[PDB]
Design a protein around this motif. Structure first.
Motif, PDB file in Angstrom:
ATOM      1  N   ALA A 243     -41.182 -11.944  -2.021  1.00 15.70           N
ATOM      2  CA  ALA A 243     -39.897 -11.144  -2.429  1.00 15.70           C
ATOM      3  C   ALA A 243     -39.748 -10.753  -3.981  1.00 15.70           C
ATOM      4  O   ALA A 243     -39.524  -9.608  -4.413  1.00 15.70           O
ATOM      5  N   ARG A 244     -40.482 -11.914  -4.855  1.00 16.36           N
ATOM      6  CA  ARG A 244     -40.534 -11.308  -6.337  1.00 16.36           C
ATOM      7  C   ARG A 244     -41.407 -10.429  -6.476  1.00 16.36           C
ATOM      8  O   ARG A 244     -41.223  -9.399  -7.339  1.00 16.36           O
ATOM      9  N   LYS A 245     -42.600 -10.545  -5.957  1.00 15.39           N
ATOM     10  CA  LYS A 245     -43.741  -9.244  -6.126  1.00 15.39           C
ATOM     11  C   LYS A 245     -43.079  -7.967  -5.525  1.00 15.39           C
ATOM     12  O   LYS A 245     -43.203  -7.113  -6.559  1.00 15.39           O
ATOM     13  N   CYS A 246     -42.647  -7.798  -4.385  1.00 13.32           N
ATOM     14  CA  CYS A 246     -42.282  -6.619  -3.784  1.00 13.32           C
ATOM     15  C   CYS A 246     -40.854  -6.116  -4.801  1.00 13.32           C
ATOM     16  O   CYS A 246     -40.822  -4.931  -4.997  1.00 13.32           O
ATOM     17  N   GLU A 247     -39.902  -6.984  -5.211  1.00 10.17           N
ATOM     18  CA  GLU A 247     -38.860  -6.499  -6.070  1.00 10.17           C
ATOM     19  C   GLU A 247     -39.262  -5.902  -7.262  1.00 10.17           C
ATOM     20  O   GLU A 247     -38.907  -4.892  -7.717  1.00 10.17           O
ATOM     21  N   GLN A 248     -40.237  -6.647  -7.877  1.00 14.19           N
ATOM     22  CA  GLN A 248     -40.776  -6.003  -9.051  1.00 14.19           C
ATOM     23  C   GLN A 248     -41.447  -4.726  -8.982  1.00 14.19           C
ATOM     24  O   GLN A 248     -41.109  -3.682  -9.637  1.00 14.19           O
ATOM     25  N   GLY A 275     -23.289   2.611  -6.133  1.00 14.87           N
ATOM     26  CA  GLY A 275     -23.173   1.335  -5.483  1.00 14.87           C
ATOM     27  C   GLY A 275     -24.408   0.821  -5.217  1.00 14.87           C
ATOM     28  O   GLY A 275     -25.126  -0.086  -5.217  1.00 14.87           O
ATOM     29  N   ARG A 276     -25.371   1.915  -4.666  1.00 18.61           N
ATOM     30  CA  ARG A 276     -26.649   1.612  -4.263  1.00 18.61           C
ATOM     31  C   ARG A 276     -27.562   1.088  -5.314  1.00 18.61           C
ATOM     32  O   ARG A 276     -28.417   0.171  -5.309  1.00 18.61           O
ATOM     33  N   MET A 277     -27.500   1.813  -6.486  1.00 19.79           N
ATOM     34  CA  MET A 277     -28.170   1.407  -7.867  1.00 19.79           C
ATOM     35  C   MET A 277     -27.886   0.090  -8.118  1.00 19.79           C
ATOM     36  O   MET A 277     -28.663  -0.739  -8.604  1.00 19.79           O
ATOM     37  N   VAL A 281     -30.516  -2.848  -8.484  1.00 18.63           N
ATOM     38  CA  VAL A 281     -30.786  -3.510  -9.810  1.00 18.63           C
ATOM     39  C   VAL A 281     -30.238  -4.952  -9.837  1.00 18.63           C
ATOM     40  O   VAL A 281     -30.824  -5.768 -11.171  1.00 18.63           O
ATOM     41  N   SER A 282     -29.583  -5.411  -9.187  1.00 17.34           N
ATOM     42  CA  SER A 282     -28.688  -6.680  -9.338  1.00 17.34           C
ATOM     43  C   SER A 282     -29.719  -7.781  -9.151  1.00 17.34           C
ATOM     44  O   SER A 282     -29.631  -8.988  -9.554  1.00 17.34           O
ATOM     45  N   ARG A 283     -30.722  -7.364  -8.389  1.00 16.98           N
ATOM     46  CA  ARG A 283     -31.774  -8.445  -8.042  1.00 16.98           C
ATOM     47  C   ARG A 283     -32.772  -8.752  -9.599  1.00 16.98           C
ATOM     48  O   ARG A 283     -33.230 -10.044  -9.497  1.00 16.98           O
ATOM     49  N   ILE A 284     -33.072  -7.680 -10.170  1.00 14.91           N
ATOM     50  CA  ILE A 284     -33.665  -8.234 -11.442  1.00 14.91           C
ATOM     51  C   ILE A 284     -32.963  -8.705 -12.534  1.00 14.91           C
ATOM     52  O   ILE A 284     -31.782  -8.538 -12.651  1.00 14.91           O
ATOM     53  N   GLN A 285     -33.743  -9.897 -12.782  1.00 13.79           N
ATOM     54  CA  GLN A 285     -32.819 -10.595 -13.932  1.00 13.79           C
ATOM     55  C   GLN A 285     -32.336  -9.841 -15.379  1.00 13.79           C
ATOM     56  O   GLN A 285     -33.472  -9.350 -15.713  1.00 13.79           O
ATOM     57  N   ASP A 286     -31.298 -10.031 -15.750  1.00 14.58           N
ATOM     58  CA  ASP A 286     -30.887  -9.398 -16.923  1.00 14.58           C
ATOM     59  C   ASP A 286     -31.191  -7.892 -17.042  1.00 14.58           C
ATOM     60  O   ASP A 286     -31.725  -7.220 -18.205  1.00 14.58           O
ATOM     61  N   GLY A 287     -30.979  -7.114 -15.413  1.00 10.10           N
ATOM     62  CA  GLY A 287     -30.998  -5.768 -15.513  1.00 10.10           C
ATOM     63  C   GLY A 287     -29.875  -4.830 -15.689  1.00 10.10           C
ATOM     64  O   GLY A 287     -29.903  -3.756 -15.511  1.00 10.10           O
ATOM     65  N   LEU A 288     -28.882  -5.608 -15.691  1.00  4.52           N
ATOM     66  CA  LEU A 288     -27.529  -4.802 -15.513  1.00  4.52           C
ATOM     67  C   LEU A 288     -26.942  -4.587 -17.060  1.00  4.52           C
ATOM     68  O   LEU A 288     -25.744  -4.001 -16.807  1.00  4.52           O
ATOM     69  N   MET A 337     -13.945  -1.003  -8.985  1.00  4.37           N
ATOM     70  CA  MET A 337     -13.502  -1.876  -7.862  1.00  4.37           C
ATOM     71  C   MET A 337     -14.362  -1.576  -6.502  1.00  4.37           C
ATOM     72  O   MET A 337     -14.969  -2.392  -5.970  1.00  4.37           O
ATOM     73  N   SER A 338     -14.642  -0.387  -6.457  1.00  5.79           N
ATOM     74  CA  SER A 338     -15.458  -0.057  -5.111  1.00  5.79           C
ATOM     75  C   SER A 338     -17.053  -0.170  -5.356  1.00  5.79           C
ATOM     76  O   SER A 338     -17.463  -0.893  -4.445  1.00  5.79           O
ATOM     77  N   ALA A 339     -17.560   0.443  -6.342  1.00 12.64           N
ATOM     78  CA  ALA A 339     -19.035   0.698  -6.374  1.00 12.64           C
ATOM     79  C   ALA A 339     -19.688  -0.814  -6.909  1.00 12.64           C
ATOM     80  O   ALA A 339     -20.642  -1.174  -6.373  1.00 12.64           O
ATOM     81  N   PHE A 340     -19.144  -1.463  -7.930  1.00  7.59           N
ATOM     82  CA  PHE A 340     -19.727  -2.212  -8.808  1.00  7.59           C
ATOM     83  C   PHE A 340     -19.329  -3.737  -8.269  1.00  7.59           C
ATOM     84  O   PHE A 340     -19.287  -4.760  -9.017  1.00  7.59           O
ATOM     85  N   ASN A 341     -18.406  -3.851  -7.140  1.00 11.82           N
ATOM     86  CA  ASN A 341     -18.147  -4.953  -6.413  1.00 11.82           C
ATOM     87  C   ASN A 341     -17.265  -5.926  -7.651  1.00 11.82           C
ATOM     88  O   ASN A 341     -17.178  -7.146  -7.487  1.00 11.82           O
ATOM     89  N   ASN A 342     -16.389  -5.168  -8.252  1.00 10.38           N
ATOM     90  CA  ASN A 342     -15.438  -5.908  -9.180  1.00 10.38           C
ATOM     91  C   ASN A 342     -16.069  -6.930  -9.977  1.00 10.38           C
ATOM     92  O   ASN A 342     -15.508  -8.155 -10.161  1.00 10.38           O
TER      93      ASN A 342
END
Ligand code: ZN
Ligand code: ZN
Ligand code: ZN
Lengths: 715, 86, 1149
Positions: A243-248, A275-277, A281-288, A337-342
């Motif tokens: 998971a980590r290697k593929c996400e990276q 929303g897809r972006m 990017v939510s999976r990468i640590q400190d990427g937001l 509210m819609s795309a960024f999940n509040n």
């Protein structure tokens, strides 16, 4: 010798997929026991040699196979050998129970149980010369599956299980979890390297030919597929690494492109892509963080641009200004509210941007002050409440009010306009007023609401007094005109005393009667009359037809005077009405502009005469319109009063702090003043310094001798 | 000719105990207070407005401010003093 | 002592001391046996004379309830509640504020205080003598139910019983607050109370006691629909007729509420409004026109009708033909509304329809003339909102249909011109007009605007000079497209563009040379000037050198760096050969310097600009600037980024093609970097082709130390001297082949040397691999029939211990045959039959020949190859059958018109092997990208897929695999066959205990299943169908076979757990209904135990089985409104109680 032949014949039957009777099984067990009764090393060597020979002459079949053939061969032979070894261990329980246990404790080195011996023999005979081919074929099959082909997953799973099981320590003989030495050193490293290579090629090739939006869907699908593969036909220990290697390799190397595309997607509204972006990017640590900063800057720029397009008209049109602010805030709140999940960070960015462009914008630059926004908000509220969806717009206005730094300006303007709306009975509904009062209770404190409620109390008292005055007139001589009065407390209202005025003789009766009545009922109270806020209705009987016209008391005074003479001089109208120069000039200009008083600069030598003949289209005409400069003068005065009140409040806060803390420094005093007064406005340091200096001159606090920049309270 | 039909007037009531003068200092409520008219114009002389209370009593701001240093009661009343206007 | 001093000062008869003591006490509360003092002190300061101390006391109640014993919270709440009913207004209001503050600070999901509040609030609301207390209590209860509705589930009947009678009270504020409270209650109420409330509302509506109450009840229904939505769907069949009947009453206020209720129903419960859209639409269309006092407060019903039509159109995609049939003409005819707001609503509805439209297009095209005729009248009005709406509709319509407005430009341009040069026009109107003009110009042929250029140019030129910069930017954007229209460079236009050139240049140049304007206008001016020079630069006079000097000046600033690079790229590549030579000498060094500015877009842009400038202006090239640009390339040629490497290699190729005298300077770092990139495992696609082209161009030049032999040695040195990746050999072989085909005169010697190297027995395996790959690559394009021993050497290399060399030999034999098909293909065909020992490799060679040969050159031998393949289909050795099946499938692609029916013919008559062979060969003609074979496959694959019914065991598996491949790759050709193939796929998931066989040896048991493969394939097909097409199959027959799968084999268990986890997200409603049946196999699997006489492998296997099972359990548990289930709650309690399950649950946490 004779015994061993029977064991060999029986055991060779065990290693073939043919059933044997339980009697034969117990017969072999009994012969093993009889051979046992040290001297058991010969039998151990016999089984070892038989296993080595069997693996050696089995390997000759699969030496030249390739691709799926070697996988099928290995899987089938491994399963058969595993079951046969289990059966053999079942047969030889006596040996491994006694002789092997005795050897292990006494200090033997190469003695194992039957099952472990079979596993070791397999690893050293068949697994070693075939692992390269098996692993390469498995990797080729995985690559074929990744390219859109249906494969037999049961071939990979058997190989993985065989690799996992053939990792026993063979020396410790005791363990808790599973040993993955062979699994990691023969399969997993190559698998992860191949995955990295495959995806680092595919992502580049896709990005060189397609936009980022499709690449996001491709990446999501690839991640779901990888979860499928790892959960279907791989071990459980490689899940996190894969998971980590593929996400990276699929996200972390394209963060620059993602950041570039974020601005483009923000410019042309595309909520699904955003929303897809955010999901990717939510999976990468400190990427937001970069996304948050970009969104904050975008919202600030959009708000500033939206306010700027309104132009100069926004300086005197509260509705347009507030509607622009509300539109921007509503659009971006819905987007968050819609795309960024509040998320909390994006909400904070939106709040920061809104607070930034509400207080400082193009409108405030024209007025050279940041206090124009609360003024416009208060004027919008007054327009809304003057003469269903009202609740929603009031709630939205209250949401806007949260970002205003200087709320005292809003409070003062709202109080003044509510006083105007109460003294003259022009309110849309009392329910809307109650709702607004409740909302201000929720947002503001409690002192402001009590100050507001005092006006309602005075209005109710006046309403009670009016009818009871009407009753007193019935048991007495009556009045020629309909009379209504509103008595208000002097200290609870923002109204100032009127200028000099001569009451027309047609109104002295009501004045005297009400003055006598109020002096009778209340003692020790004196009434001051505001003739600049009093209004009435006039009826004419010298025009082409009967009109009734409503006008102010000043207009009556300067209009009823023309009942005696048709022509008058403005230098004599002043003496007739006792009105000052400026007010009389403005009211005369207003009367002239209605074409109902014909003779722009007005001078004492000017002559004014009543104009008969021409009349109005309708029967009821209103000539009580507000002067142009009066509003500007009132705004300037109420802006000066706010600064004076700010200075007084700062002085009071400093006095309280010095009374509580006897001796205090300078920076601590400043911090305490700021934290005490922060809920209403943000004071400036020079203002606090001037307040301290003026408080020193009044003998309230004094600077201590020595230890400079320190104050002390004085009684 | 014009004739008056109806009138809607507005009036304000204030305590008549003081004849348009400060109760603390024997001086008018519109002109400068004694402790500031004795001295020359300064920063203090800039602000000499009239302060009203909840009891609807009016004095000079400086007069009531210096009165409140020791006492805590309205001079013409027996109740606590609270500012509500300036 | 401090807390005692504070309380001593909190009664000091001085306001300042009290305020400061309260303030720092509050600061501190951010003690035991003394809380009873501070609480009483605060509740007594709640009645203080000063207002500031009261406000501080109220704010101090927040942090006090979180730092006090639970007993004193009760007395605080009791005192506040009993003060709320007092006879003093100030105490009542301040206590209400304090109670709201106390409620706000309580943590949600605490129960006792809520019950205590509710007990008194119900009585307070029930009173009908003090309306103020009623309003305060309603507000408090709304605040309470807003955030703490999950608790006090036992007080809901009492809350309902007290709230419902308040919908009749004379004062409307009570009714509104009651409606809000009822909505908040319904948000989290129970099932029985919801039914009670709905039945009460319906009964009261049926009675129709008073006109005033009916509006309140309709508003309450609308609010309930808005708040709940999905819980009211099963009642519309009774609700809707009532509001339909009430719509006909002659009351203006009643109609609006009914239409709003219709809108709420349409928006919030889409599933249950389907049978009623036809009547809602009709009512809305009937009441759009309602105006009984004008013949061409009644505007509110028209507003509501427009809003309801907008809502209906926005959320129904499948009703587009009906919409364009019935509702579009009414909306078009209502564009002449007398009132502004209703007109805006109609406009917004039509924009919503247009965005939903994104055949509907044909009907829209038919409707366009009416839209244009309606908008022509509205574009001439005093109002700016109407004109803005007209321009927005025009923009959206052009965006939907690109060429819709071809025949209406003569009547549309005057409106735009009128709006552009009107003094009574705002900035927004001008920006909208310019955007509409830009969109119209971009999406139409240049020939339609030619008569209108004379009228279009002056207003745009005037708009360029507007003080406001946004209008200037929009004007420049329009001007660029106007320049493109006035003189196209790809079409033979007869227009004369001379007169307006001076005007456009003069208006753009002043903006270009500003140095103080906003950055956006700077970039737009640069782009516009670049377009002007590119298109009409031949008619300009002496201003071109000065403009190009300005372009140079803009190249040294960070803000406007990329835009001018793109402008220079545009100018350089123009049919009008502009003279950029005065700029080139001072411009090339700057562009070279840009290559070190660690920005990807700038690097790509400057590389493209350098490429085009070198290609087009090679006459004025200088060695100094060529060296300057060559000095920064080596850092760019790397495997980290391949696009930049490709651009650099393309630049080098262009330089070698146009300036061959400067290639002596690439013998250092550049060549080493290129050679190192050749061995990279990531080389693919464009980079490989660029490298081959660069090598071919470099060989022919003839520079020293860079000949054929030097490059060959530099490429093949590492292999002969001693490569850890297989791709490196292929890349080196391709480069060697490119070099050989560049200069054919030296080919035979290299080929002979390679043949000797592969023949020699002293050479290592690495040398033989590279030699064979190079021979195969060279023979692809060059005829190699002159080498007599090539076939013998290759066939000898076939029998080698290493697998890589054998694969290379097969690939080389396949590749060489492509060069000379008639000489080699018969040899391979004969050798397949002649020698049975080596057939698995000759068939791979034949596969390579089939896959890498020209269509025209392989036509004659199709019959021979087909005959051989069909002869060899029936083969005993598996593995040899797969390759012949793949060869047959790939041969089908060549001439698919006649080969495919011949393939289908074997299905009816044939052996078991032939049917499986053809069904397998079908799957190799399916690819993700569109192919010419697709129309034939869509019609024919039904005959192949009806083989799922077959007595043969293997053929069903083959058909399932083919169906899975078709579903995964190209789902568009199986969707219409789902209704006929789904039952057969579901049937294959059965156990079929007939085939199960068990073998016995003592007390040990072994099972063998001959149907496991088919079941696994069927479940894989089901998993593929989940992602491919979930909206074309029943979601309830699927779950039955999923449940069957959860008790199946271990691999099927894993696959079914994965499918269940995936289905927990997609359509969670279906899973919730079946949740009772789902957990039982999960609980059975989680709690099972193995026999004690087993090795550790079974224990570990059961461990990961349990972990995956409870992962699926947690995934099911995360479903909303799923914890309130009997079996789910029992399982949760059992997991919590049992340590063995709890530990493994914590393991996956
Ligand atoms: Zn005084
Ligand atoms: Zn003074
Ligand atoms: Zn008093």
């Amino acid at each position: 010798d004779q015994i061993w032949d029977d064991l060999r014949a029986g055991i060779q039957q065990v290693y073939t997929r043919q059933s044997m009777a339980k009697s034969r099984y117990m017969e072999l067990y009994t012969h093993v026991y009889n051979y046992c009764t040290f001297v058991g090393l010969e039998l151990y060597k016999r089984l070892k040699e038989f296993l080595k020979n069997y693996l050696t002459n089995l390997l000759k079949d699969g030496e030249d196979l390739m691709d799926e053939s070697v996988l099928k061969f290995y899987t089938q032979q491994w399963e058969d050998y595993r079951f046969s070894s289990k059966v053999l261990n079942g047969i030889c329980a006596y040996l491994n129970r006694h002789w092997v246990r005795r050897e292990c404790d006494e200090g033997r080195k190469g003695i194992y149980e039957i099952y472990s011996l079979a596993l070791v023999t397999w690893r050293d005979c068949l697994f070693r010369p075939l692992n390269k081919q098996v692993t390469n074929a498995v990797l080729k099959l995985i690559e074929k599956e990744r390219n859109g082909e249906t494969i037999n997953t049961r071939l990979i799973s058997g190989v993985v299980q065989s690799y996992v099981e053939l990792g026993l320590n063979e020396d410790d003989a005791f363990a808790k979890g599973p040993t993955l030495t062979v699994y990691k050193e023969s399969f997993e490293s190559q698998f992860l390297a191949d995955t990295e290579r495959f995806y680092t090629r595919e992502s580049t090739e896709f990005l060189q030919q397609n936009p980022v939006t499709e690449y996001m869907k491709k990446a999501e699908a690839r991640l779901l597929e990888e979860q499928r593969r790892v959960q279907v036909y791989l071990h459980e220990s490689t899940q996190d690494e894969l998971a980590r290697k593929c996400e990276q390799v699929l996200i972390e190397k394209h963060l620059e492109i993602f950041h570039t595309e974020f601005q483009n997607l923000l410019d042309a509204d595309k909520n699904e892509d955003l929303g897809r972006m955010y999901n990717l990017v939510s999976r990468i640590q400190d990427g937001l963080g970069e996304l948050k900063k970009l969104l904050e800057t975008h919202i600030h720029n959009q708000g500033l641009a939206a306010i700027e397009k309104c132009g100069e008209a926004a300086l005197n049109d509260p509705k347009m200004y507030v509607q622009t602010v509300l539109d921007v805030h509503k659009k971006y709140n819905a987007l968050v509210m819609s795309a960024f999940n509040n998320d909390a960070g994006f909400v904070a960015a939106l709040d920061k941007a809104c607070g930034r462009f509400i207080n400082n914008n193009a409108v405030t630059k024209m007025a050279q002050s940041s206090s124009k926004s609360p003024e416009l908000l208060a004027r919008y509220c007054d327009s809304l409440l003057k003469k269903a969806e009202l609740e929603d717009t009031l709630n939205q206005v209250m949401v806007v009010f949260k970002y205003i730094e200087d709320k005292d300006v809003f409070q003062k303007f709202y109080a003044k306009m509510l006083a105007k709306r109460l003294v003259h009975q022009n309110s849309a509904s009392d329910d809307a007023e109650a709702s607004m009062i409740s909302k201000l209770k929720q947002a503001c404190g409690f002192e402001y609401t009590s100050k507001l409620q005092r006006m309602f109390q005075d209005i109710g008292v006046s309403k009670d007094l009016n009818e009871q005055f009407k009753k007193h007139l019935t048991n007495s001589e009556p009045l020629d005109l309909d009379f209504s009065i509103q008595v208000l407390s002097s200290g609870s209202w923002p109204f100032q005393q009127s200028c000099t005025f001569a009451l027309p003789s047609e109104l002295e009766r009501s004045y005297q009667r009400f003055t006598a009545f109020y002096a009778s009922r209340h003692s020790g109270r004196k009434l001051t009359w505001l003739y600049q806020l009093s209004k009435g209705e006039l009826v004419t009987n010298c025009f082409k037809n009967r009109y009734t016209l409503q006008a102010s008391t000043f207009q009556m005074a300067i209009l009823l005077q023309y009942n005696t003479e048709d022509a008058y001089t403005v230098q004599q109208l002043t003496d007739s009405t006792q009105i000052k120069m400026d007010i009389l000039a403005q009211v005369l200009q207003i009367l002239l502009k209605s074409k109902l008083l014909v003779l722009v600069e007005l001078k004492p030598d000017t002559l004014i005469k009543l104009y008969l003949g021409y009349k109005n289209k309708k029967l009821r005409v209103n000539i009580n319109v507000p002067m142009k400069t009066e509003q500007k003068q009132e705004q300037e005065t109420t802006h000066k009063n706010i600064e004076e009140d700010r200075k007084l409040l700062i002085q009071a806060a400093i006095v309280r702090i010095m009374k509580m803390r006897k001796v205090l420094k300078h920076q601590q005093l400043l911090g305490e003043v700021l934290t005490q007064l922060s809920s209403r406005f943000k004071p400036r340091v020079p203002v606090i310094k001037k307040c301290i200096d003026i408080l020193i001159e009044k003998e309230y606090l004094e600077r201590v001798d020595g230890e400079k920049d320190t104050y002390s309270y004085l009684a | 000719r014009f004739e008056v039909k109806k009138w809607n007037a507005v009036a304000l009531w204030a305590w008549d105990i003081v004849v348009d003068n400060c109760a603390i200092c024997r001086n008018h409520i519109m002109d400068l207070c004694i402790e500031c008219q004795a001295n020359q114009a300064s920063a203090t002389s800039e602000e000499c407005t009239v302060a009203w209370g909840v009891c609807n009593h009016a004095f000079h701001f400086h007069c009531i401010s210096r009165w409140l240093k020791t006492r805590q009661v309205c001079p013409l009343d027996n109740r606590e003093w609270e500012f509500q206007k300036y | 002592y401090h807390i005692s001093n504070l309380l001593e000062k909190m009664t000091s008869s001085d306001k300042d001391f009290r305020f400061m003591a309260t303030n720092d006490l509050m600061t501190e509360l951010q003690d035991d046996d003394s809380e009873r003092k501070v609480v009483k002190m605060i509740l007594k300061l709640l009645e203080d004379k000063n207002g500031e101390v009261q406000n501080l006391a109220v704010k101090c109640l927040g942090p006090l309830v979180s730092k006090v014993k639970e007993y004193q919270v009760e007395t605080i709440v009791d005192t506040l509640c009993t003060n709320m009913l007092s006879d003093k207004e100030q105490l009542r209001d301040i206590s209400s504020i304090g109670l709201k503050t106390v409620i706000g600070e309580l943590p949600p999901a605490a129960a006792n205080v809520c019950k205590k509040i509710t007990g008194r609030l119900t009585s307070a609301i029930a009173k009908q003598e003090d309306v103020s207390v009623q309003l305060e209590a309603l507000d408090i209860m709304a605040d309470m139910l807003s955030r703490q509705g999950g608790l006090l589930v036992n007080f809901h009947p009492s809350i309902l019983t007290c709230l419902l009678p308040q919908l009749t009270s004379p004062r409307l504020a009570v009714r509104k607050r009651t409606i809000i409270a009822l909505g908040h209650l319904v948000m989290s109420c129970g099932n029985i109370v919801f039914v009670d409330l709905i039945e009460h509302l319906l009964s009261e509506l049926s009675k129709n006691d008073s006109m005033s109450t009916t509006r309140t009840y309709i508003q309450c229904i609308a609010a309930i629909s808005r708040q709940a939505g999905h819980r009211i769907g099963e009642y519309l069949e009774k609700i809707i007729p009532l509001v339909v009947k009430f719509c006909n009453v002659d009351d203006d206020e009643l109609r609006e509420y009914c239409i709003q209720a219709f809108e709420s129903f349409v928006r919030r419960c889409p599933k249950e409004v389907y049978p009623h859209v036809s009547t809602i639409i009709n009512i809305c269309l009937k009441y759009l026109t309602y105006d009984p006092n004008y013949n061409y407060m009644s505007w509110k019903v028209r507003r509501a009708a427009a809003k309801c039509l907008d809502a209906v159109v926005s959320t129904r995609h499948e009703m587009l033909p009906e919409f364009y049939k019935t509702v579009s003409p009414a909306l078009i005819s209502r564009f002449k509304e007398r009132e502004e707001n209703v007109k805006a609503d109609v406009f917004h509805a039509y924009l919503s329809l247009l965005k939903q439209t994104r055949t509907p297009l044909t009907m829209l095209q038919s409707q366009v003339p009416n839209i244009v005729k309606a908008l022509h009248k509205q574009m001439k009005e005093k109002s700016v909102k109407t004109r803005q709406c007209c321009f927005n509709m025009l923009t959206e319509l052009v965006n939907v249909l690109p060429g819709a407005l071809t025949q209406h430009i003569p009547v549309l341009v005057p409106g735009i011109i009128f709006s552009l040069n009107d003094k009574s026009s705002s900035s927004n109107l001008k920006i909208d007009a310019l955007s509409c003009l830009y969109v119209i110009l971009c999406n139409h042929s240049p020939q339609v605007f030619h008569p209108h250029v004379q009228a279009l140019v002056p207003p745009v030129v005037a708009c360029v000079g507007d003080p406001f910069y946004k209008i200037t930017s929009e004007a420049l954007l329009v001007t660029q497209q106007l320049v493109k229209v006035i003189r196209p460079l790809d079409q033979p236009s007869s227009f004369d563009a001379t007169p307006y050139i001076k005007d456009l240049f003069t208006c753009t140049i002043k903006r270009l040379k500003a140095a103080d304007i906003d950055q956006e206008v700077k970039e737009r001016a640069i782009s516009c000037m670049g377009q002007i020079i590119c298109n009409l630069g031949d008619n300009l006079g002496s201003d071109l050198p000065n403009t190009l000097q300005i372009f140079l000046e803009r190249l040294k600033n960070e803000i406007t760096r990329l835009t001018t690079v793109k402008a220079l790229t545009l100018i350089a590549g123009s049919p009008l050969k502009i003279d950029l030579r005065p700029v080139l000498g001072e411009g090339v060094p700057i562009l070279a310097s840009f290559l070190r500015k660690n920005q990807r877009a700038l690097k790509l842009g400057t590389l493209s600009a350098l490429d085009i400038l070198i290609k087009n202006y090679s006459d004025s090239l200088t060695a100094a600037m060529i060296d300057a640009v060559l000095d920064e390339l080596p850092p760019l040629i790397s495997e980290s980024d391949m696009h930049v490497s490709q651009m650099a290699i393309s630049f080098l190729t262009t330089l070698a093609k146009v300036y061959p005298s400067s290639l002596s300077k690439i013998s250092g770092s550049i060549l080493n970097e290129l050679i190192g990139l050749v061995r990279s495992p990531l080389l693919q696609g464009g980079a490989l082709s660029a490298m081959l082209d660069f090598f071919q161009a470099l060989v022919v030049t003839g520079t020293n130390n860079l000949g054929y032999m030097d490059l060959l040695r530099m490429l093949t040195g590492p292999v002969y001297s001693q490569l850890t990746h297989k791709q490196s050999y292929y890349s080196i072989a391709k480069c060697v082949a490119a070099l050989t085909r560049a200069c054919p005169k030296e080919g035979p010697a290299v080929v002979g040397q390679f043949i000797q190297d592969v023949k020699n027995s002293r050479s290592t395996d690495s040398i033989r691999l590279l030699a064979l790959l190079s021979l195969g690559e060279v023979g692809h394009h060059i005829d190699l029939s002159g080498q007599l021993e090539l076939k013998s050497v290759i066939l000898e290399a076939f029998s080698s211990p290493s697998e890589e060399v054998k694969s290379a030999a097969s690939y080389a034999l396949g590749s060489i045959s492509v060069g000379n098909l008639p000489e080699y293909l018969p040899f391979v065909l004969q050798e397949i039959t002649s020698q049975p020992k080596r057939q698995y490799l000759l068939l791979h060679s034949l596969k390579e020949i089939i896959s890498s040969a020209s269509v025209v050159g392989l036509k004659p031998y199709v019959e021979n190859i087909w005959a051989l393949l069909l002869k060899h289909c029936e083969c005993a050795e598996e593995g040899t059958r797969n390759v012949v099946v793949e060869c047959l499938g790939k041969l089908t692609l060549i001439d698919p018109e006649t080969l495919l029916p011949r393939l289908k013919g074997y299905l009816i008559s044939g052996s078991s092997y032939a049917r499986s062979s053809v069904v397998t060969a079908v799957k190799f003609t399916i690819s993700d990208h569109p192919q010419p074979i697709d129309p034939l496959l869509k019609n024919c694959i039904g005959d192949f897929l009806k083989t799922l019914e077959d007595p043969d065991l293997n053929v069903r598996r083959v058909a399932l695999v083919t169906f899975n491949s078709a579903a995964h790759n190209k789902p568009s050709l199986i969707r219409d066959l789902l209704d006929t193939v789904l039952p057969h796929l579901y049937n294959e998931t059965k156990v079929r205990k007939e085939l199960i066989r068990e073998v016995e040896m003592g007390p040990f048991k072994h099972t063998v299943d001959d149907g496991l493969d088919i079941r696994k394939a069927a479940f894989e097909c089901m998993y593929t169908l989940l992602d491919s097409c979930l909206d074309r199959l029943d979601i309830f027959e699927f779950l039955n076979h999923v449940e069957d799968g959860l008790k199946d084999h271990y691999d099927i268990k894993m696959l079914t757990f994965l499918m269940l986890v995936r289905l927990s997200t997609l359509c969670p409603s279906a899973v919730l209904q079946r949740l009772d049946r789902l957990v039982e196999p999960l609980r059975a699997t989680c709690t099972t135990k193995v026999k004690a006489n087993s090795v550790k492998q079974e224990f570990e296997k059961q461990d990961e089985l349990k972990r995956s099972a409870m992962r699926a359990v947690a995934a099911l548990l995360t479903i909303p409104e799923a914890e309130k289930s009997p079996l789910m709650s029992e399982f949760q309690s059992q997991i919590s109680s049992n340590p063995e399950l709890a530990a493994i649950f914590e393991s996956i946490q």
